[PDB]
Amino acid sequence: LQALFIWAILQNKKELSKVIWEQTKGCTLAALGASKLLKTLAKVKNDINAA
Amino acid sequence: GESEELANEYETRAVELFTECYSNDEDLAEQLLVYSCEAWGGSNCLELAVE
């Protein structure tokens, strides 16, 4: 489930992510790891809309 | 006073429309920034923003 949460969270799906977040066991670890991945991918300079 | 208020209204309108045009597509919005309207006032969108 954490792998599918990474799948949905990378794609910027933003609403499938919460539905699958509610099913997860390690909830706060999932929220912190997703926050870290997205704060990294917000630094990529091309396609600033996705950023 | 009326012309100052109407100036603020249209500059807000230009900013808000161009951020939509850039958010939906980048390449065509950069096409828009450089065009001269076949002598609107004989100038450019970016040049009128500067002047």
mmCIF file of N, CA, C and O in Angstrom:
data_model
loop_
_atom_site.group_PDB
_atom_site.id
_atom_site.type_symbol
_atom_site.label_atom_id
_atom_site.label_comp_id
_atom_site.label_asym_id
_atom_site.label_seq_id
_atom_site.Cartn_x
_atom_site.Cartn_y
_atom_site.Cartn_z
ATOM 1 N N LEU A 1 0.821 -1.203 0.000
ATOM 2 C CA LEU A 1 0.000 0.000 0.000
ATOM 3 C C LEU A 1 0.852 1.249 0.000
ATOM 4 O O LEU A 1 0.472 2.253 -0.601
ATOM 5 N N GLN A 2 2.018 1.193 0.633
ATOM 6 C CA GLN A 2 2.929 2.327 0.600
ATOM 7 C C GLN A 2 3.523 2.502 -0.787
ATOM 8 O O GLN A 2 3.778 3.628 -1.219
ATOM 9 N N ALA A 3 3.696 1.406 -1.523
ATOM 10 C CA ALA A 3 4.173 1.511 -2.895
ATOM 11 C C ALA A 3 3.126 2.136 -3.799
ATOM 12 O O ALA A 3 3.448 2.975 -4.648
ATOM 13 N N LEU A 4 1.864 1.758 -3.623
ATOM 14 C CA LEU A 4 0.829 2.386 -4.431
ATOM 15 C C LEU A 4 0.592 3.822 -3.999
ATOM 16 O O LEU A 4 0.224 4.667 -4.818
ATOM 17 N N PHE A 5 0.856 4.127 -2.736
ATOM 18 C CA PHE A 5 0.787 5.501 -2.279
ATOM 19 C C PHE A 5 1.894 6.344 -2.890
ATOM 20 O O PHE A 5 1.668 7.503 -3.235
ATOM 21 N N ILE A 6 3.084 5.769 -3.067
ATOM 22 C CA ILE A 6 4.158 6.457 -3.783
ATOM 23 C C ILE A 6 3.778 6.687 -5.238
ATOM 24 O O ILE A 6 4.005 7.778 -5.787
ATOM 25 N N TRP A 7 3.173 5.669 -5.865
ATOM 26 C CA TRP A 7 2.675 5.779 -7.236
ATOM 27 C C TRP A 7 1.720 6.945 -7.386
ATOM 28 O O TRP A 7 1.937 7.831 -8.208
ATOM 29 N N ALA A 8 0.688 6.986 -6.556
ATOM 30 C CA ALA A 8 -0.297 8.048 -6.661
ATOM 31 C C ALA A 8 0.257 9.385 -6.207
ATOM 32 O O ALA A 8 -0.247 10.427 -6.622
ATOM 33 N N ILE A 9 1.288 9.391 -5.374
ATOM 34 C CA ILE A 9 1.720 10.656 -4.809
ATOM 35 C C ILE A 9 2.711 11.368 -5.714
ATOM 36 O O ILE A 9 2.827 12.591 -5.650
ATOM 37 N N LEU A 10 3.460 10.592 -6.487
ATOM 38 C CA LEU A 10 4.384 11.118 -7.485
ATOM 39 C C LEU A 10 3.671 11.776 -8.676
ATOM 40 O O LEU A 10 4.115 12.800 -9.193
ATOM 41 N N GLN A 11 2.565 11.164 -9.101
ATOM 42 C CA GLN A 11 1.816 11.583 -10.272
ATOM 43 C C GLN A 11 1.077 12.881 -10.027
ATOM 44 O O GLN A 11 0.448 13.391 -10.956
ATOM 45 N N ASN A 12 1.134 13.400 -8.802
ATOM 46 C CA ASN A 12 0.314 14.506 -8.308
ATOM 47 C C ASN A 12 -1.166 14.237 -8.539
ATOM 48 O O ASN A 12 -1.825 14.907 -9.328
ATOM 49 N N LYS A 13 -1.684 13.225 -7.852
ATOM 50 C CA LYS A 13 -3.087 12.898 -8.053
ATOM 51 C C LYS A 13 -3.985 13.532 -7.006
ATOM 52 O O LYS A 13 -5.170 13.754 -7.273
ATOM 53 N N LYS A 14 -3.488 13.719 -5.787
ATOM 54 C CA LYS A 14 -4.003 14.660 -4.790
ATOM 55 C C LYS A 14 -5.348 14.255 -4.184
ATOM 56 O O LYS A 14 -5.731 14.750 -3.121
ATOM 57 N N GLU A 15 -6.040 13.291 -4.777
ATOM 58 C CA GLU A 15 -7.291 12.800 -4.215
ATOM 59 C C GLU A 15 -7.383 11.298 -4.179
ATOM 60 O O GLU A 15 -8.097 10.772 -3.327
ATOM 61 N N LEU A 16 -6.707 10.587 -5.065
ATOM 62 C CA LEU A 16 -6.490 9.170 -4.859
ATOM 63 C C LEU A 16 -5.518 8.946 -3.715
ATOM 64 O O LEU A 16 -5.588 7.922 -3.021
ATOM 65 N N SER A 17 -4.646 9.927 -3.482
ATOM 66 C CA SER A 17 -3.640 9.829 -2.440
ATOM 67 C C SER A 17 -4.264 9.803 -1.061
ATOM 68 O O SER A 17 -3.824 9.047 -0.203
ATOM 69 N N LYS A 18 -5.294 10.609 -0.828
ATOM 70 C CA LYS A 18 -5.891 10.646 0.500
ATOM 71 C C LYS A 18 -6.708 9.398 0.764
ATOM 72 O O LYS A 18 -6.709 8.873 1.885
ATOM 73 N N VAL A 19 -7.382 8.898 -0.267
ATOM 74 C CA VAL A 19 -8.164 7.677 -0.160
ATOM 75 C C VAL A 19 -7.264 6.507 0.162
ATOM 76 O O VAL A 19 -7.604 5.651 0.984
ATOM 77 N N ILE A 20 -6.079 6.472 -0.431
ATOM 78 C CA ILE A 20 -5.206 5.362 -0.095
ATOM 79 C C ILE A 20 -4.402 5.653 1.174
ATOM 80 O O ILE A 20 -3.931 4.729 1.843
ATOM 81 N N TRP A 21 -4.273 6.921 1.563
ATOM 82 C CA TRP A 21 -3.611 7.246 2.814
ATOM 83 C C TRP A 21 -4.413 6.770 4.004
ATOM 84 O O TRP A 21 -3.839 6.253 4.964
ATOM 85 N N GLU A 22 -5.736 6.896 3.939
ATOM 86 C CA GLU A 22 -6.599 6.450 5.026
ATOM 87 C C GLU A 22 -6.560 4.950 5.254
ATOM 88 O O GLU A 22 -6.954 4.499 6.328
ATOM 89 N N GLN A 23 -6.114 4.170 4.282
ATOM 90 C CA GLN A 23 -6.050 2.730 4.426
ATOM 91 C C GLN A 23 -4.734 2.258 5.009
ATOM 92 O O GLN A 23 -4.617 1.086 5.365
ATOM 93 N N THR A 24 -3.755 3.141 5.124
ATOM 94 C CA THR A 24 -2.394 2.766 5.446
ATOM 95 C C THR A 24 -2.271 2.518 6.948
ATOM 96 O O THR A 24 -3.072 3.007 7.744
ATOM 97 N N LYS A 25 -1.275 1.725 7.345
ATOM 98 C CA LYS A 25 -1.009 1.482 8.762
ATOM 99 C C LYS A 25 -0.088 2.536 9.367
ATOM 100 O O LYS A 25 -0.435 3.186 10.357
ATOM 101 N N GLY A 26 1.093 2.704 8.792
ATOM 102 C CA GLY A 26 2.018 3.716 9.250
ATOM 103 C C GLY A 26 1.627 5.066 8.710
ATOM 104 O O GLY A 26 2.201 5.535 7.728
ATOM 105 N N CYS A 27 0.628 5.685 9.330
ATOM 106 C CA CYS A 27 -0.008 6.861 8.758
ATOM 107 C C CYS A 27 0.885 8.087 8.786
ATOM 108 O O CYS A 27 1.061 8.745 7.753
ATOM 109 N N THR A 28 1.458 8.411 9.944
ATOM 110 C CA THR A 28 2.284 9.605 10.036
ATOM 111 C C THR A 28 3.611 9.426 9.319
ATOM 112 O O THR A 28 4.156 10.398 8.789
ATOM 113 N N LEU A 29 4.144 8.202 9.272
ATOM 114 C CA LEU A 29 5.331 7.990 8.455
ATOM 115 C C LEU A 29 5.020 8.177 6.991
ATOM 116 O O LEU A 29 5.855 8.686 6.239
ATOM 117 N N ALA A 30 3.829 7.766 6.566
ATOM 118 C CA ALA A 30 3.443 7.971 5.181
ATOM 119 C C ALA A 30 3.315 9.446 4.870
ATOM 120 O O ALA A 30 3.787 9.901 3.826
ATOM 121 N N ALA A 31 2.742 10.214 5.791
ATOM 122 C CA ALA A 31 2.569 11.637 5.536
ATOM 123 C C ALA A 31 3.903 12.369 5.522
ATOM 124 O O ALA A 31 4.124 13.247 4.684
ATOM 125 N N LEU A 32 4.840 11.963 6.377
ATOM 126 C CA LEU A 32 6.136 12.631 6.386
ATOM 127 C C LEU A 32 6.989 12.231 5.191
ATOM 128 O O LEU A 32 7.693 13.074 4.618
ATOM 129 N N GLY A 33 6.934 10.967 4.782
ATOM 130 C CA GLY A 33 7.696 10.565 3.617
ATOM 131 C C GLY A 33 7.160 11.165 2.337
ATOM 132 O O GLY A 33 7.928 11.534 1.441
ATOM 133 N N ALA A 34 5.841 11.309 2.246
ATOM 134 C CA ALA A 34 5.273 11.956 1.077
ATOM 135 C C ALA A 34 5.596 13.433 1.058
ATOM 136 O O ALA A 34 5.868 13.991 -0.009
ATOM 137 N N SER A 35 5.603 14.074 2.229
ATOM 138 C CA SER A 35 5.996 15.474 2.300
ATOM 139 C C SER A 35 7.435 15.670 1.859
ATOM 140 O O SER A 35 7.738 16.620 1.135
ATOM 141 N N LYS A 36 8.320 14.743 2.215
ATOM 142 C CA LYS A 36 9.720 14.885 1.823
ATOM 143 C C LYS A 36 9.920 14.676 0.324
ATOM 144 O O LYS A 36 10.657 15.438 -0.319
ATOM 145 N N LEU A 37 9.282 13.646 -0.251
ATOM 146 C CA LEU A 37 9.363 13.439 -1.700
ATOM 147 C C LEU A 37 8.827 14.617 -2.489
ATOM 148 O O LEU A 37 9.428 15.027 -3.489
ATOM 149 N N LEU A 38 7.703 15.172 -2.068
ATOM 150 C CA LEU A 38 7.149 16.262 -2.842
ATOM 151 C C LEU A 38 7.929 17.553 -2.654
ATOM 152 O O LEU A 38 8.042 18.334 -3.603
ATOM 153 N N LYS A 39 8.517 17.779 -1.476
ATOM 154 C CA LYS A 39 9.391 18.937 -1.331
ATOM 155 C C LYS A 39 10.667 18.785 -2.136
ATOM 156 O O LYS A 39 11.280 19.789 -2.499
ATOM 157 N N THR A 40 11.094 17.557 -2.417
ATOM 158 C CA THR A 40 12.208 17.428 -3.346
ATOM 159 C C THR A 40 11.786 17.716 -4.772
ATOM 160 O O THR A 40 12.411 18.535 -5.449
ATOM 161 N N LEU A 41 10.719 17.069 -5.242
ATOM 162 C CA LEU A 41 10.302 17.237 -6.630
ATOM 163 C C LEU A 41 9.758 18.620 -6.940
ATOM 164 O O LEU A 41 9.594 18.939 -8.117
ATOM 165 N N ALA A 42 9.478 19.444 -5.936
ATOM 166 C CA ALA A 42 9.146 20.836 -6.196
ATOM 167 C C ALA A 42 10.352 21.693 -6.544
ATOM 168 O O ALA A 42 10.175 22.876 -6.840
ATOM 169 N N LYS A 43 11.563 21.151 -6.504
ATOM 170 C CA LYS A 43 12.754 21.922 -6.818
ATOM 171 C C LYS A 43 13.235 21.726 -8.241
ATOM 172 O O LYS A 43 14.163 22.418 -8.659
ATOM 173 N N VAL A 44 12.641 20.799 -8.986
ATOM 174 C CA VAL A 44 13.042 20.578 -10.365
ATOM 175 C C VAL A 44 12.570 21.750 -11.207
ATOM 176 O O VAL A 44 11.389 22.112 -11.188
ATOM 177 N N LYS A 45 13.495 22.356 -11.948
ATOM 178 C CA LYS A 45 13.240 23.682 -12.488
ATOM 179 C C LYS A 45 12.382 23.680 -13.740
ATOM 180 O O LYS A 45 11.604 24.615 -13.927
ATOM 181 N N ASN A 46 12.496 22.688 -14.615
ATOM 182 C CA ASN A 46 11.615 22.706 -15.773
ATOM 183 C C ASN A 46 10.219 22.245 -15.375
ATOM 184 O O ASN A 46 10.051 21.514 -14.396
ATOM 185 N N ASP A 47 9.220 22.715 -16.131
ATOM 186 C CA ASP A 47 7.795 22.468 -15.894
ATOM 187 C C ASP A 47 7.390 22.936 -14.494
ATOM 188 O O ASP A 47 7.075 22.144 -13.612
ATOM 189 N N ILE A 48 7.418 24.258 -14.314
ATOM 190 C CA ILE A 48 7.158 24.831 -13.001
ATOM 191 C C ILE A 48 5.713 24.668 -12.544
ATOM 192 O O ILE A 48 5.421 24.909 -11.366
ATOM 193 N N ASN A 49 4.791 24.269 -13.427
ATOM 194 C CA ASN A 49 3.428 23.992 -12.982
ATOM 195 C C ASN A 49 3.382 22.739 -12.124
ATOM 196 O O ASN A 49 2.720 22.716 -11.078
ATOM 197 N N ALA A 50 4.081 21.685 -12.559
ATOM 198 C CA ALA A 50 4.196 20.466 -11.766
ATOM 199 C C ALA A 50 4.925 20.723 -10.461
ATOM 200 O O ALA A 50 4.586 20.127 -9.432
ATOM 201 N N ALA A 51 5.900 21.629 -10.482
ATOM 202 C CA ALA A 51 6.541 22.080 -9.258
ATOM 203 C C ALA A 51 5.545 22.753 -8.330
ATOM 204 O O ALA A 51 5.570 22.518 -7.118
ATOM 205 N N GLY B 1 -9.128 60.160 -10.167
ATOM 206 C CA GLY B 1 -9.429 59.042 -9.290
ATOM 207 C C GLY B 1 -10.106 57.886 -10.001
ATOM 208 O O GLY B 1 -9.767 56.717 -9.767
ATOM 209 N N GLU B 2 -11.049 58.193 -10.899
ATOM 210 C CA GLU B 2 -11.698 57.115 -11.642
ATOM 211 C C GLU B 2 -10.737 56.437 -12.605
ATOM 212 O O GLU B 2 -10.753 55.204 -12.729
ATOM 213 N N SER B 3 -9.889 57.209 -13.288
ATOM 214 C CA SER B 3 -8.955 56.580 -14.208
ATOM 215 C C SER B 3 -7.902 55.782 -13.469
ATOM 216 O O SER B 3 -7.445 54.758 -13.979
ATOM 217 N N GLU B 4 -7.556 56.178 -12.247
ATOM 218 C CA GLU B 4 -6.626 55.373 -11.471
ATOM 219 C C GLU B 4 -7.242 54.046 -11.049
ATOM 220 O O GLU B 4 -6.576 53.000 -11.113
ATOM 221 N N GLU B 5 -8.516 54.057 -10.642
ATOM 222 C CA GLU B 5 -9.170 52.800 -10.274
ATOM 223 C C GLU B 5 -9.326 51.871 -11.471
ATOM 224 O O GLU B 5 -9.122 50.653 -11.359
ATOM 225 N N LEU B 6 -9.648 52.431 -12.633
ATOM 226 C CA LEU B 6 -9.813 51.591 -13.809
ATOM 227 C C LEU B 6 -8.474 51.049 -14.302
ATOM 228 O O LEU B 6 -8.412 49.925 -14.820
ATOM 229 N N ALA B 7 -7.392 51.808 -14.104
ATOM 230 C CA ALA B 7 -6.055 51.312 -14.399
ATOM 231 C C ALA B 7 -5.703 50.113 -13.546
ATOM 232 O O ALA B 7 -5.166 49.120 -14.055
ATOM 233 N N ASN B 8 -5.971 50.201 -12.240
ATOM 234 C CA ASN B 8 -5.700 49.068 -11.359
ATOM 235 C C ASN B 8 -6.523 47.851 -11.737
ATOM 236 O O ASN B 8 -6.017 46.717 -11.685
ATOM 237 N N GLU B 9 -7.757 48.076 -12.190
ATOM 238 C CA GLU B 9 -8.615 46.959 -12.558
ATOM 239 C C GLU B 9 -8.103 46.233 -13.798
ATOM 240 O O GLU B 9 -8.016 44.999 -13.809
ATOM 241 N N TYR B 10 -7.690 46.971 -14.823
ATOM 242 C CA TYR B 10 -7.168 46.282 -15.999
ATOM 243 C C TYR B 10 -5.783 45.690 -15.814
ATOM 244 O O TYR B 10 -5.473 44.687 -16.462
ATOM 245 N N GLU B 11 -4.939 46.239 -14.944
ATOM 246 C CA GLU B 11 -3.658 45.562 -14.766
ATOM 247 C C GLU B 11 -3.824 44.278 -13.965
ATOM 248 O O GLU B 11 -3.147 43.279 -14.263
ATOM 249 N N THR B 12 -4.777 44.255 -13.020
ATOM 250 C CA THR B 12 -5.137 43.008 -12.352
ATOM 251 C C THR B 12 -5.666 41.986 -13.344
ATOM 252 O O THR B 12 -5.318 40.798 -13.279
ATOM 253 N N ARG B 13 -6.478 42.447 -14.291
ATOM 254 C CA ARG B 13 -7.072 41.563 -15.283
ATOM 255 C C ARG B 13 -6.020 40.949 -16.199
ATOM 256 O O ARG B 13 -6.091 39.755 -16.511
ATOM 257 N N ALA B 14 -5.023 41.736 -16.604
ATOM 258 C CA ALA B 14 -3.953 41.209 -17.451
ATOM 259 C C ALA B 14 -3.117 40.167 -16.734
ATOM 260 O O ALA B 14 -2.788 39.126 -17.319
ATOM 261 N N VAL B 15 -2.760 40.429 -15.472
ATOM 262 C CA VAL B 15 -1.976 39.462 -14.705
ATOM 263 C C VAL B 15 -2.740 38.156 -14.534
ATOM 264 O O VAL B 15 -2.204 37.065 -14.771
ATOM 265 N N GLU B 16 -4.013 38.249 -14.151
ATOM 266 C CA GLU B 16 -4.797 37.048 -13.904
ATOM 267 C C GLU B 16 -5.109 36.272 -15.164
ATOM 268 O O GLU B 16 -5.300 35.060 -15.088
ATOM 269 N N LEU B 17 -5.173 36.922 -16.316
ATOM 270 C CA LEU B 17 -5.412 36.124 -17.504
ATOM 271 C C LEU B 17 -4.134 35.451 -17.960
ATOM 272 O O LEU B 17 -4.171 34.309 -18.441
ATOM 273 N N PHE B 18 -2.994 36.128 -17.819
ATOM 274 C CA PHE B 18 -1.778 35.502 -18.305
ATOM 275 C C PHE B 18 -1.330 34.364 -17.404
ATOM 276 O O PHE B 18 -0.705 33.421 -17.889
ATOM 277 N N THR B 19 -1.640 34.408 -16.108
ATOM 278 C CA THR B 19 -1.264 33.259 -15.291
ATOM 279 C C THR B 19 -2.089 32.021 -15.632
ATOM 280 O O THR B 19 -1.567 30.904 -15.564
ATOM 281 N N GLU B 20 -3.329 32.196 -16.094
ATOM 282 C CA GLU B 20 -4.116 31.076 -16.595
ATOM 283 C C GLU B 20 -3.537 30.535 -17.888
ATOM 284 O O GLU B 20 -3.387 29.315 -18.041
ATOM 285 N N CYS B 21 -3.215 31.437 -18.821
ATOM 286 C CA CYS B 21 -2.610 31.022 -20.081
ATOM 287 C C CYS B 21 -1.275 30.330 -19.887
ATOM 288 O O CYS B 21 -0.944 29.433 -20.661
ATOM 289 N N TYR B 22 -0.506 30.707 -18.872
ATOM 290 C CA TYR B 22 0.766 30.034 -18.673
ATOM 291 C C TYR B 22 0.578 28.713 -17.965
ATOM 292 O O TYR B 22 1.289 27.752 -18.258
ATOM 293 N N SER B 23 -0.366 28.650 -17.033
ATOM 294 C CA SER B 23 -0.629 27.421 -16.309
ATOM 295 C C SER B 23 -1.210 26.330 -17.184
ATOM 296 O O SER B 23 -0.980 25.156 -16.896
ATOM 297 N N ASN B 24 -1.939 26.662 -18.245
ATOM 298 C CA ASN B 24 -2.468 25.620 -19.116
ATOM 299 C C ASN B 24 -1.448 25.154 -20.146
ATOM 300 O O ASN B 24 -1.460 23.988 -20.541
ATOM 301 N N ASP B 25 -0.563 26.041 -20.586
ATOM 302 C CA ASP B 25 0.478 25.677 -21.538
ATOM 303 C C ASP B 25 1.622 26.664 -21.390
ATOM 304 O O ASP B 25 1.383 27.853 -21.179
ATOM 305 N N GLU B 26 2.861 26.188 -21.499
ATOM 306 C CA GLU B 26 3.987 27.100 -21.344
ATOM 307 C C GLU B 26 4.443 27.667 -22.674
ATOM 308 O O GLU B 26 4.737 28.865 -22.777
ATOM 309 N N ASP B 27 4.527 26.820 -23.694
ATOM 310 C CA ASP B 27 5.135 27.237 -24.945
ATOM 311 C C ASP B 27 4.284 28.269 -25.660
ATOM 312 O O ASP B 27 4.814 29.262 -26.163
ATOM 313 N N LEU B 28 2.970 28.098 -25.661
ATOM 314 C CA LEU B 28 2.143 29.080 -26.339
ATOM 315 C C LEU B 28 2.006 30.369 -25.541
ATOM 316 O O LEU B 28 1.813 31.436 -26.132
ATOM 317 N N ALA B 29 2.141 30.321 -24.219
ATOM 318 C CA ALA B 29 2.152 31.571 -23.469
ATOM 319 C C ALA B 29 3.431 32.352 -23.735
ATOM 320 O O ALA B 29 3.410 33.589 -23.839
ATOM 321 N N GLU B 30 4.550 31.647 -23.898
ATOM 322 C CA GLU B 30 5.759 32.324 -24.340
ATOM 323 C C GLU B 30 5.667 32.774 -25.789
ATOM 324 O O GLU B 30 6.423 33.657 -26.196
ATOM 325 N N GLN B 31 4.779 32.175 -26.582
ATOM 326 C CA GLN B 31 4.471 32.768 -27.879
ATOM 327 C C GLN B 31 3.725 34.078 -27.706
ATOM 328 O O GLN B 31 3.953 35.027 -28.459
ATOM 329 N N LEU B 32 2.820 34.136 -26.726
ATOM 330 C CA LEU B 32 2.023 35.346 -26.511
ATOM 331 C C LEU B 32 2.851 36.521 -26.033
ATOM 332 O O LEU B 32 2.553 37.668 -26.381
ATOM 333 N N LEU B 33 3.861 36.271 -25.200
ATOM 334 C CA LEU B 33 4.630 37.372 -24.611
ATOM 335 C C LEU B 33 5.380 38.238 -25.606
ATOM 336 O O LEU B 33 5.805 39.329 -25.235
ATOM 337 N N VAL B 34 5.575 37.801 -26.840
ATOM 338 C CA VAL B 34 6.532 38.468 -27.702
ATOM 339 C C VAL B 34 5.892 39.050 -28.949
ATOM 340 O O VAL B 34 6.603 39.497 -29.845
ATOM 341 N N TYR B 35 4.569 39.075 -29.033
ATOM 342 C CA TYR B 35 3.927 39.423 -30.292
ATOM 343 C C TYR B 35 3.459 40.865 -30.290
ATOM 344 O O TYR B 35 3.229 41.458 -29.237
ATOM 345 N N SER B 36 3.325 41.429 -31.488
ATOM 346 C CA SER B 36 3.202 42.868 -31.638
ATOM 347 C C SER B 36 1.834 43.340 -32.122
ATOM 348 O O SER B 36 1.670 44.541 -32.366
ATOM 349 N N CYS B 37 0.876 42.422 -32.313
ATOM 350 C CA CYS B 37 -0.548 42.701 -32.605
ATOM 351 C C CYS B 37 -0.747 43.418 -33.943
ATOM 352 O O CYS B 37 -1.833 43.938 -34.224
ATOM 353 N N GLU B 38 0.289 43.372 -34.789
ATOM 354 C CA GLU B 38 0.383 44.125 -36.039
ATOM 355 C C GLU B 38 0.097 45.605 -35.788
ATOM 356 O O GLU B 38 -0.826 46.189 -36.354
ATOM 357 N N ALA B 39 0.912 46.189 -34.900
ATOM 358 C CA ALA B 39 0.827 47.567 -34.402
ATOM 359 C C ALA B 39 -0.493 47.832 -33.671
ATOM 360 O O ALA B 39 -1.370 48.546 -34.150
ATOM 361 N N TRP B 40 -0.618 47.203 -32.498
ATOM 362 C CA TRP B 40 -1.589 47.668 -31.507
ATOM 363 C C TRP B 40 -1.327 49.123 -31.171
ATOM 364 O O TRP B 40 -2.100 50.013 -31.528
ATOM 365 N N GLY B 41 -0.209 49.366 -30.492
ATOM 366 C CA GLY B 41 0.362 50.675 -30.284
ATOM 367 C C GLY B 41 1.750 50.665 -30.880
ATOM 368 O O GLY B 41 2.553 51.571 -30.656
ATOM 369 N N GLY B 42 2.031 49.625 -31.660
ATOM 370 C CA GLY B 42 3.346 49.443 -32.232
ATOM 371 C C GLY B 42 4.354 48.895 -31.259
ATOM 372 O O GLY B 42 5.510 49.319 -31.274
ATOM 373 N N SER B 43 3.950 47.973 -30.396
ATOM 374 C CA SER B 43 4.830 47.509 -29.339
ATOM 375 C C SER B 43 4.420 46.098 -28.958
ATOM 376 O O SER B 43 3.686 45.431 -29.689
ATOM 377 N N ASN B 44 4.883 45.654 -27.803
ATOM 378 C CA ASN B 44 4.845 44.266 -27.387
ATOM 379 C C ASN B 44 4.184 44.181 -26.023
ATOM 380 O O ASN B 44 4.089 45.175 -25.304
ATOM 381 N N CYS B 45 3.714 42.983 -25.681
ATOM 382 C CA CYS B 45 3.064 42.760 -24.395
ATOM 383 C C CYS B 45 4.033 42.991 -23.246
ATOM 384 O O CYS B 45 3.709 43.651 -22.252
ATOM 385 N N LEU B 46 5.254 42.504 -23.405
ATOM 386 C CA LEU B 46 6.263 42.645 -22.370
ATOM 387 C C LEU B 46 6.766 44.079 -22.294
ATOM 388 O O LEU B 46 7.011 44.605 -21.202
ATOM 389 N N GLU B 47 6.866 44.743 -23.445
ATOM 390 C CA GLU B 47 7.304 46.132 -23.481
ATOM 391 C C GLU B 47 6.276 47.063 -22.859
ATOM 392 O O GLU B 47 6.643 48.012 -22.162
ATOM 393 N N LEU B 48 4.987 46.817 -23.099
ATOM 394 C CA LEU B 48 3.964 47.626 -22.450
ATOM 395 C C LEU B 48 3.887 47.339 -20.971
ATOM 396 O O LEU B 48 3.494 48.212 -20.200
ATOM 397 N N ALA B 49 4.222 46.124 -20.555
ATOM 398 C CA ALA B 49 4.314 45.875 -19.126
ATOM 399 C C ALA B 49 5.468 46.636 -18.500
ATOM 400 O O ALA B 49 5.365 47.081 -17.355
ATOM 401 N N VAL B 50 6.568 46.794 -19.230
ATOM 402 C CA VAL B 50 7.722 47.494 -18.679
ATOM 403 C C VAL B 50 7.474 48.991 -18.628
ATOM 404 O O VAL B 50 7.699 49.635 -17.600
ATOM 405 N N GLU B 51 6.987 49.565 -19.726
ATOM 406 C CA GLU B 51 6.903 51.015 -19.837
ATOM 407 C C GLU B 51 5.852 51.630 -18.933
ATOM 408 O O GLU B 51 5.906 52.834 -18.680
#
